[PDB]
Amino acid sequence: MKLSQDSSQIELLKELMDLQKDMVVMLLSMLEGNVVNGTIGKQMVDMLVESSNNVEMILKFFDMFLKLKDLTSSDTFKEYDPDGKGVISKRDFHKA
């Protein structure tokens, strides 16, 4: 949330997202031999419910940024300003 409010930190944001992807694939590699009532699943749901707030924030972030690829270039925004490379007055974008 902090690195997205201002520019000149897109490299830091990209490296942080890469680290997050590596962390999630690491903690996902812990379940490739899972059982319906294994201990690793209990430990993982425990560490999830102990930090429900932060994972909820990142889930809201991902949902907000995934509901944008389709909300824009599907109905009206693609034909709002058909000039060339993307130009928007940032006021029609708000109402869109």
Could you give the C-alpha distances from 94 to 44, 57, 62, 84, in angstroms and in order? 40, 23, 20, 20
Q: Is 81 exposed, middle or buried (0-12, 13-18, 19+ CB in 10 A)?
A: middle
Q: Copy the structure tokens of residue 50.
A: 């102990």
Under 8 Å between Cβ of 17 and 4: no
Element spanning 24, H or E: helix 10-28
Report the alpha-carbon distance of residue 68 to residue 66 in Å, rounded.
5
Q: Copy the structure tokens of residue 90.
A: 């940032």
Question: What is the DSSP code (8-state) at residue 31?
Answer: G
Under 8 Å between Cβ of 24 and 47: no
Q: Copy the structure tokens of residue 51.
A: 């930090």
Q: Resolution for this model in angstroms, one decimal place?
A: 3.3
Q: Is 80 exposed, middle or buried (0-12, 13-18, 19+ CB in 10 A)?
A: middle
- Among 54, 58, 50, CA closest to 17: 58
Considering just the CA atoms, what is the radius of gyration of the chain in Å? 19
